[PDB]
Amino acid sequence: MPRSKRSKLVTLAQTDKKGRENKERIFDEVREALDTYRYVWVLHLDDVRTPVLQEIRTSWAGSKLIMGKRKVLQKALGEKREEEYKENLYQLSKLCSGVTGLLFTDEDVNTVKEYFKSYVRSDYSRPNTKAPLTFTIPEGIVYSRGGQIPAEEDVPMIHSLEPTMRNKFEIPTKIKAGKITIDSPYLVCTEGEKLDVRQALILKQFGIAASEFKVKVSAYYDNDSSTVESTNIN
Amino acid sequence: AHFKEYQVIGRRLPTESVPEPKLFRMRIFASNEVIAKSRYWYFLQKLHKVKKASGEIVSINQINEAHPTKVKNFGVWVRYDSRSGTHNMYKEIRDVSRVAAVETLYQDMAARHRARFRSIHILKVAEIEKTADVKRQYVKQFLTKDLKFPLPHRVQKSTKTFSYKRPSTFY
Amino acid sequence: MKYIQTEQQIEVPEGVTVSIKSRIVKVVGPRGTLTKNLKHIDVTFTKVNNQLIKVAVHNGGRKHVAALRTVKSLVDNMITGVTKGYKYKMRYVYAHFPINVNIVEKDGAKFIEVRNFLGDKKIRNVPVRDGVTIEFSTNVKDEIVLSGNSVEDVSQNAADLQQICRVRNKDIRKFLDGIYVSHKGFITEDL
Amino acid sequence: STDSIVKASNWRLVEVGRVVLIKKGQSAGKLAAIVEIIDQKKVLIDGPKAGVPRQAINLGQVVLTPLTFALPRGARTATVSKKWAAAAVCEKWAASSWAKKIAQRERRAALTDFERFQVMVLRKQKRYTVKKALAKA
Amino acid sequence: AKSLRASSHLNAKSVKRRGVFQKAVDAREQRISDKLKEDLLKQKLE
Amino acid sequence: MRVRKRQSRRTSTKLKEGIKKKASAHRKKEKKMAKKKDPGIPSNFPYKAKILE
Amino acid sequence: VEPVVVIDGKGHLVGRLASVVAKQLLNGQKIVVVRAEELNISGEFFRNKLKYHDFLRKATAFNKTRGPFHFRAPSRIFYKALRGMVSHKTARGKAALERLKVFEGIPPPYDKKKRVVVPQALRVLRLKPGRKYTTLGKLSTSVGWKYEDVVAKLEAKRKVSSAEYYAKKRAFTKKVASANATAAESDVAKQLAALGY
RNA sequence: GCUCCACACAAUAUAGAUGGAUACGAAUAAGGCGUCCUUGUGGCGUCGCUGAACCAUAGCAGGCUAGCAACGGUGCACUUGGCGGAAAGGCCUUGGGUGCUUGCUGGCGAAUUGCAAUGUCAUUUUGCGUGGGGAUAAAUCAUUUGUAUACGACUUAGA
RNA sequence: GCAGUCAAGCGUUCAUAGCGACAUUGCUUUUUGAUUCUUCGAUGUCGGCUCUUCCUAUCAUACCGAAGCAGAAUUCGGUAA
RNA sequence: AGAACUGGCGAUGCGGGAUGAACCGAACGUAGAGUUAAGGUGCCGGAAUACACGCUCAUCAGACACCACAAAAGGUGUUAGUUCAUCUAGACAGCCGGACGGUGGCCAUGGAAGUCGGAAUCCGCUAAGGAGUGUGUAACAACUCACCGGCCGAAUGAACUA
RNA sequence: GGCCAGCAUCAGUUUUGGUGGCAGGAUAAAUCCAUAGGAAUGUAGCUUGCCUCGGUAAGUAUUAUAGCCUGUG
């Protein structure tokens, strides 16, 4: 566009793009993990809290979780059998569809899947998921938790977020002088319905975390067997 | 009228102690051989200390296109000495012959840059031997397979001052 | 660069029908029908398989491509209005004097009416546009829900409604009273 | 009906193998195939069956006739003449009312004054019967 | 002061005209037509 | 609404001669004050490698 | 070629039709423009309004009555575009102007007369597609013309009468074409075809 | 005396015939015509790409005559009805009467204007004189009232 | 106004050969609204009674945005003669 | 401003720049034919509303002396070019999530937790995450952005020249 | 014995068409003719998913049930 083009943002944050060199570094690191560790895994985790990911990383000192862009991990595993870093290694790359989540480990293959079956943590609604539970906002004054907990311990919502309640959340909030209030007990979501993204934003602003989370796994490479296996659990 | 390509040659008036001075050659585009020799002397004066009095035209001949009927893309080196100092330029042209391509290039330069023929220089011209060597989109759009475009505004001429038919734009 | 041609697809819902002979356009659907005068825009519609239409602009400039893109946008808007419709909403609020908005059938035009705005004795009137149907929101205090097949009519009606009540000679920061848009969702809701 | 009418934008699009009738210059009045486009304002016309030498020509010097016939892009004049002889497009042009009106005006330009008198006599004779047919139905 | 051509005062007068301002002229024209018909009958009687 | 007067486009012969004298003076001044890398191969040329050899 | 030429004013640019009629009048050919209210002008309507308003502001100071006139009628406005193209002060210009005639609409008897158009003056042929253009009648109403509402009614009535006349003419021409086609293949018709007629 | 219809000769010139100003509307990234149905922003065929078109154009500047084919084409004065008010003053149309008809076939005159001299063929107006129709008024000067005025001028009255 | 500093650019080494937009430092009578009771050679006339007309670089009237505009009142800015 | 030389006028008509002391053309007896300059070819005004290629919507552009004072740039008004970068181990934009822990870092104290006040601004893990670019609370909270990850896909971004 | 014009052919000035024989280019280049090769904006055939039962889309296939370019004579 020679003219009348949209202006670019000029924000002056200290951070800068890592560039292709970071991708090459992750590629070399994945190759080192492939040539060092025997077993390999392709975890699927579309979203995870950063502290939860750190807690998963600290669960064992004997293993490493080289996260990266799915294309980078695929090229490290070989996009095709001719490009595979190791025999039959290309098959492990084919199974991945989601975020990964590669988990090289020297630990016994059974213990890893057992720990994954045991691990579980609370998580947000993660839209396109069925509603964990049905609830309705109190017809009286709104509170920071949304009334999920008894009002005597709850505190009124800060006024500063009220306009977002009218614009983003679509709730017909009325900002009464002293506190925000709604004339009627608006329902956040019915049980089992596919959540709208605005409904998930409302549940996040209210702090509800009824949904559970547990990383799934689809397959694990075995360098000793030189072949992928399709064991899976959720 | 139409531009005519020409080649020029010289040897700087051979003198004693320098038998057979080295020949030089430069393709030139001009309406006539006189202008071609003038541009050749003007180029030799810039690339060498020699002068028209110091040399002579060893030969002059027109260069007809080997395949004038054939369509050909033609990239062309260009530089114009205005308004600021001279700088390199490049343009693609789809023309049936190199001379018509040079004429369309001179017209596009005089239009989009107001450059005069005295300022324009043609450092090089070459055909695009193969597809996808083209870069700018305006030539690429004509390369599409089975391309077809209309001419909706066919404004027919009317020699008569009056027209009882109320002519249509058809098409 | 005087592109050799440009075009944009126009998806046709199976229940929609949109005859086009002249540049004037017409559309029909379960919710009704609509029409528009596009003769000025100089564009050529082209049906392919009755499920799509490809407007085209040969040898056009960048401004002509922008005209073609807005033509496709107006066509998609007319299709969404004849299929889904539109259901505008506008909350109103007051500080000390309650608002008394009410519909009236003066002169047969179904004039909108407002009273006691900020205590003013003037009775402002905002005539309803053709097609759009005013209706107060059910079980929702101090609200009105405009709706109409065309975005243009309902949008101009909401604009005139918010403009007729504009405050004057008073600081806006203290006087929050005045009608304001609340939502611009489709009549379906949820389909 | 659910059909979405669209009528018709039946442009006479330029394309390879299109025949066109030059309207001026030494090649005026002769058909030529468009072997290949050069740009938006030029095309490589070829009319070897008409005897016109192959050359690039501006689109504004020529008009696009409705008739069309297949031609590979970049075709040499021999293949163009072969495709012209195979398609027999000249017969389709002579069948066209446009070529008929052209030949009619051309014959009218050459008419002898005695031929003009015979034309007036035959026209009066035809007009007599044409008027006798009127009112009788 | 507001101009005599000012659109606001003219619109206010146009709104005021719909009521008694028009009803009075209507009743006046009706009474005038009635008096005219009476004057016509008084002449036609003789 | 109320159109305002536009400046005259007339040549103003007096102003023409004055501008000519001012131009000659500016040229003399620029002449008196006068006493006090190749671009390289353009990008996107299809045959840049051929010129190097 | 004809004693008079009733050019149609619809769709024509002001300056081109003015320049062509100004030369046709100098040749002695008679002309009578019609439907001047439909005459078009290049550019958006606000430009033409700003241009006409500039001419309206000018006037003699000590006595405006003797200053230049600013006719509001579309026909007089088109005449002003032509009046400057001819040396009206000369007697030859006074003679050439007498042959000229202009009227809004198509007043009788001209409505029954055949009308023509000048292709060079047509807006459709000279103007580039998609460009804005001003209608002379809208500028006339903007400059205070107060007859556009009247001309439209007589124009619609004349259009309805001409449409009925064309319907009768088509009903007659169909029978005429049938009477000609029934004579087709007659030996005299074959001789006329051999002679190009 | 005046006014209308023509003709007898004149004067007056022409801003300039030397076949016909041949009539749908809208758009020009669309249309004219025919057909058909499901009457619609419908399907099909046809056409432009200029008026280089349609009619009319033959007879002494267009005669005197004999017939053939059809009851057509058309000038003239009447005549039936209708439409047209934007400057209508124009158009359509019923019924015969009277001429031509080159639609077709024949009988005569052309000359000498001497090898061309625009080689005279149209109306705008005006006067007298013919023969067929129609009826017999206003303004101003002057006096005079004032709704007016420098004079002019304006508004009324008086057989 | 005078003296000075960085440089977005320019210019054969290259800004430090030379210039240089936008910024900036030191002075022109006191940091406690204290003083400022200074007013300093126009050598040439400008200023006023009736009155017409034109311009915006708008005091007011008319329509708007902003300003700690809660009101009133007020400031600037846009159009407007 | 002060000196030399080359030229027009003065003493000079004629054609064009609408006219003009200087500009362009130009060797002044009376006429005919013919060919030209400057200057033009829509009308006034004799001559193409010629050809072929590119830019211009101006709320008084332009036909202007404009290679001259306002003239340095500003315009998200257009067109063509030069340079520097990313890219199917995913280019710009578009929608969703992460944006972590010593930590509520060290100095002011009815209170600053990144965002009322001062000097630093690291390690730990990451694909990344800044003692923090902004919105907002008394603080918090929360929202949001620099950069990454999730989805369509391919050309995209910045500085200059004309 | 004078005034005004036309015609035919002539002398000078001059304007606009038709038409024929020649010299020169790379002894024009083209086009065309035979050939050795190359490729796609891939020709026929073949192969793969689809389907209104046969055309789409991508691999092969350098002339085959079309053709193009380069050099040579």
PDB file of N, CA, C and O (backbone and C1' of nucleotides) in Angstrom, chain J residues 18-36:
ATOM      1  P     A J  18      -1.363  36.192 -24.384  1.00  0.00           P
ATOM      2  O5'   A J  18      -1.933  37.149 -25.521  1.00  0.00           O
ATOM      3  C5'   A J  18      -2.757  36.645 -26.564  1.00  0.00           C
ATOM      4  C4'   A J  18      -3.858  37.617 -26.905  1.00  0.00           C
ATOM      5  C3'   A J  18      -3.444  39.080 -26.958  1.00  0.00           C
ATOM      6  O3'   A J  18      -2.906  39.436 -28.220  1.00  0.00           O
ATOM      7  C1'   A J  18      -5.455  38.838 -25.702  1.00  0.00           C
ATOM      8  P     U J  19      -1.397  39.967 -28.344  1.00  0.00           P
ATOM      9  O5'   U J  19      -1.485  41.478 -27.855  1.00  0.00           O
ATOM     10  C5'   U J  19      -2.065  42.485 -28.674  1.00  0.00           C
ATOM     11  C4'   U J  19      -1.818  43.853 -28.093  1.00  0.00           C
ATOM     12  C3'   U J  19      -0.415  44.075 -27.546  1.00  0.00           C
ATOM     13  O3'   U J  19       0.465  44.518 -28.566  1.00  0.00           O
ATOM     14  C1'   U J  19      -2.039  44.780 -25.949  1.00  0.00           C
ATOM     15  P     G J  20       2.041  44.226 -28.494  1.00  0.00           P
ATOM     16  O5'   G J  20       2.573  45.321 -27.471  1.00  0.00           O
ATOM     17  C5'   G J  20       2.289  46.699 -27.688  1.00  0.00           C
ATOM     18  C4'   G J  20       2.424  47.508 -26.424  1.00  0.00           C
ATOM     19  C3'   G J  20       3.839  47.581 -25.852  1.00  0.00           C
ATOM     20  O3'   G J  20       4.081  48.879 -25.311  1.00  0.00           O
ATOM     21  C1'   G J  20       2.376  46.695 -24.228  1.00  0.00           C
ATOM     22  P     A J  21       4.713  50.028 -26.240  1.00  0.00           P
ATOM     23  O5'   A J  21       6.268  49.682 -26.276  1.00  0.00           O
ATOM     24  C5'   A J  21       7.146  50.178 -25.277  1.00  0.00           C
ATOM     25  C4'   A J  21       8.585  49.857 -25.593  1.00  0.00           C
ATOM     26  C3'   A J  21       9.061  48.463 -25.206  1.00  0.00           C
ATOM     27  O3'   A J  21       8.711  47.475 -26.161  1.00  0.00           O
ATOM     28  C1'   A J  21      10.649  50.081 -24.503  1.00  0.00           C
ATOM     29  P     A J  22       8.467  45.952 -25.706  1.00  0.00           P
ATOM     30  O5'   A J  22       9.929  45.324 -25.657  1.00  0.00           O
ATOM     31  C5'   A J  22      10.753  45.305 -26.819  1.00  0.00           C
ATOM     32  C4'   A J  22      12.186  44.964 -26.488  1.00  0.00           C
ATOM     33  C3'   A J  22      12.437  43.509 -26.088  1.00  0.00           C
ATOM     34  O3'   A J  22      13.712  43.086 -26.570  1.00  0.00           O
ATOM     35  C1'   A J  22      13.113  44.930 -24.334  1.00  0.00           C
ATOM     36  P     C J  23      14.121  41.532 -26.533  1.00  0.00           P
ATOM     37  O5'   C J  23      12.972  40.849 -25.665  1.00  0.00           O
ATOM     38  C5'   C J  23      13.274  39.827 -24.724  1.00  0.00           C
ATOM     39  C4'   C J  23      12.311  38.673 -24.835  1.00  0.00           C
ATOM     40  C3'   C J  23      12.322  37.932 -26.163  1.00  0.00           C
ATOM     41  O3'   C J  23      13.376  36.990 -26.255  1.00  0.00           O
ATOM     42  C1'   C J  23      10.092  38.403 -25.548  1.00  0.00           C
ATOM     43  P     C J  24      14.294  36.929 -27.571  1.00  0.00           P
ATOM     44  O5'   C J  24      13.451  36.029 -28.578  1.00  0.00           O
ATOM     45  C5'   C J  24      13.126  34.688 -28.250  1.00  0.00           C
ATOM     46  C4'   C J  24      12.174  34.087 -29.250  1.00  0.00           C
ATOM     47  C3'   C J  24      12.469  34.378 -30.712  1.00  0.00           C
ATOM     48  O3'   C J  24      13.499  33.567 -31.249  1.00  0.00           O
ATOM     49  C1'   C J  24      10.177  34.730 -30.298  1.00  0.00           C
ATOM     50  P     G J  25      14.458  34.151 -32.398  1.00  0.00           P
ATOM     51  O5'   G J  25      13.500  34.276 -33.665  1.00  0.00           O
ATOM     52  C5'   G J  25      12.850  33.128 -34.189  1.00  0.00           C
ATOM     53  C4'   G J  25      11.821  33.490 -35.231  1.00  0.00           C
ATOM     54  C3'   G J  25      12.312  34.319 -36.406  1.00  0.00           C
ATOM     55  O3'   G J  25      12.986  33.548 -37.385  1.00  0.00           O
ATOM     56  C1'   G J  25      10.259  35.193 -35.610  1.00  0.00           C
ATOM     57  P     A J  26      14.352  34.084 -38.040  1.00  0.00           P
ATOM     58  O5'   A J  26      13.903  35.367 -38.873  1.00  0.00           O
ATOM     59  C5'   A J  26      12.998  35.253 -39.960  1.00  0.00           C
ATOM     60  C4'   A J  26      12.433  36.596 -40.352  1.00  0.00           C
ATOM     61  C3'   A J  26      13.454  37.669 -40.701  1.00  0.00           C
ATOM     62  O3'   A J  26      13.928  37.567 -42.033  1.00  0.00           O
ATOM     63  C1'   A J  26      11.859  38.559 -39.202  1.00  0.00           C
ATOM     64  P     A J  27      15.481  37.815 -42.376  1.00  0.00           P
ATOM     65  O5'   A J  27      15.491  39.219 -43.128  1.00  0.00           O
ATOM     66  C5'   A J  27      15.241  40.430 -42.421  1.00  0.00           C
ATOM     67  C4'   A J  27      15.242  41.627 -43.339  1.00  0.00           C
ATOM     68  C3'   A J  27      14.235  41.566 -44.486  1.00  0.00           C
ATOM     69  O3'   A J  27      13.739  42.875 -44.765  1.00  0.00           O
ATOM     70  C1'   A J  27      16.423  41.733 -45.365  1.00  0.00           C
ATOM     71  P     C J  28      12.509  43.469 -43.918  1.00  0.00           P
ATOM     72  O5'   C J  28      11.731  44.393 -44.957  1.00  0.00           O
ATOM     73  C5'   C J  28      10.624  43.892 -45.698  1.00  0.00           C
ATOM     74  C4'   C J  28       9.825  45.008 -46.325  1.00  0.00           C
ATOM     75  C3'   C J  28      10.614  45.916 -47.265  1.00  0.00           C
ATOM     76  O3'   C J  28       9.772  46.370 -48.324  1.00  0.00           O
ATOM     77  C1'   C J  28       9.769  47.192 -45.462  1.00  0.00           C
ATOM     78  P     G J  29      10.110  45.980 -49.845  1.00  0.00           P
ATOM     79  O5'   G J  29       9.326  47.068 -50.705  1.00  0.00           O
ATOM     80  C5'   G J  29       9.331  48.438 -50.329  1.00  0.00           C
ATOM     81  C4'   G J  29       8.820  49.315 -51.443  1.00  0.00           C
ATOM     82  C3'   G J  29       7.481  48.912 -52.043  1.00  0.00           C
ATOM     83  O3'   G J  29       6.371  49.355 -51.281  1.00  0.00           O
ATOM     84  C1'   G J  29       9.023  49.317 -53.782  1.00  0.00           C
ATOM     85  P     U J  30       5.166  48.347 -50.941  1.00  0.00           P
ATOM     86  O5'   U J  30       4.308  48.298 -52.284  1.00  0.00           O
ATOM     87  C5'   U J  30       3.544  49.419 -52.701  1.00  0.00           C
ATOM     88  C4'   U J  30       2.889  49.183 -54.038  1.00  0.00           C
ATOM     89  C3'   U J  30       1.990  47.960 -54.142  1.00  0.00           C
ATOM     90  O3'   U J  30       0.692  48.162 -53.612  1.00  0.00           O
ATOM     91  C1'   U J  30       3.446  48.012 -55.993  1.00  0.00           C
ATOM     92  P     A J  31      -0.111  46.933 -52.955  1.00  0.00           P
ATOM     93  O5'   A J  31      -0.207  45.857 -54.127  1.00  0.00           O
ATOM     94  C5'   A J  31      -0.586  44.514 -53.856  1.00  0.00           C
ATOM     95  C4'   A J  31      -0.830  43.736 -55.127  1.00  0.00           C
ATOM     96  C3'   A J  31      -0.893  42.222 -54.984  1.00  0.00           C
ATOM     97  O3'   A J  31      -2.155  41.749 -54.547  1.00  0.00           O
ATOM     98  C1'   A J  31       0.532  42.774 -56.779  1.00  0.00           C
ATOM     99  P     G J  32      -2.304  40.244 -54.003  1.00  0.00           P
ATOM    100  O5'   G J  32      -1.948  39.333 -55.263  1.00  0.00           O
ATOM    101  C5'   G J  32      -2.892  39.127 -56.304  1.00  0.00           C
ATOM    102  C4'   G J  32      -2.471  38.010 -57.229  1.00  0.00           C
ATOM    103  C3'   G J  32      -2.083  36.700 -56.565  1.00  0.00           C
ATOM    104  O3'   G J  32      -3.199  35.915 -56.185  1.00  0.00           O
ATOM    105  C1'   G J  32      -0.464  37.261 -58.186  1.00  0.00           C
ATOM    106  P     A J  33      -3.098  34.931 -54.918  1.00  0.00           P
ATOM    107  O5'   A J  33      -2.242  33.701 -55.458  1.00  0.00           O
ATOM    108  C5'   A J  33      -2.713  32.913 -56.540  1.00  0.00           C
ATOM    109  C4'   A J  33      -1.646  31.981 -57.059  1.00  0.00           C
ATOM    110  C3'   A J  33      -0.988  31.077 -56.031  1.00  0.00           C
ATOM    111  O3'   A J  33      -1.773  29.951 -55.684  1.00  0.00           O
ATOM    112  C1'   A J  33       0.677  32.060 -57.372  1.00  0.00           C
ATOM    113  P     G J  34      -1.846  29.468 -54.152  1.00  0.00           P
ATOM    114  O5'   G J  34      -0.391  28.888 -53.864  1.00  0.00           O
ATOM    115  C5'   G J  34       0.120  27.811 -54.635  1.00  0.00           C
ATOM    116  C4'   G J  34       1.602  27.622 -54.434  1.00  0.00           C
ATOM    117  C3'   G J  34       2.063  27.328 -53.017  1.00  0.00           C
ATOM    118  O3'   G J  34       1.852  25.981 -52.628  1.00  0.00           O
ATOM    119  C1'   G J  34       3.487  28.942 -53.993  1.00  0.00           C
ATOM    120  P     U J  35       1.623  25.618 -51.078  1.00  0.00           P
ATOM    121  O5'   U J  35       3.057  25.826 -50.417  1.00  0.00           O
ATOM    122  C5'   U J  35       4.158  25.018 -50.803  1.00  0.00           C
ATOM    123  C4'   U J  35       5.430  25.433 -50.106  1.00  0.00           C
ATOM    124  C3'   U J  35       5.380  25.478 -48.587  1.00  0.00           C
ATOM    125  O3'   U J  35       5.512  24.203 -47.984  1.00  0.00           O
ATOM    126  C1'   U J  35       6.415  27.441 -49.397  1.00  0.00           C
ATOM    127  P     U J  36       5.209  24.025 -46.417  1.00  0.00           P
ATOM    128  O5'   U J  36       6.218  25.042 -45.720  1.00  0.00           O
ATOM    129  C5'   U J  36       6.071  25.403 -44.356  1.00  0.00           C
ATOM    130  C4'   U J  36       7.137  26.379 -43.930  1.00  0.00           C
ATOM    131  C3'   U J  36       6.996  26.952 -42.529  1.00  0.00           C
ATOM    132  O3'   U J  36       7.481  26.078 -41.524  1.00  0.00           O
ATOM    133  C1'   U J  36       7.448  28.701 -44.055  1.00  0.00           C
TER     134        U J  36
END
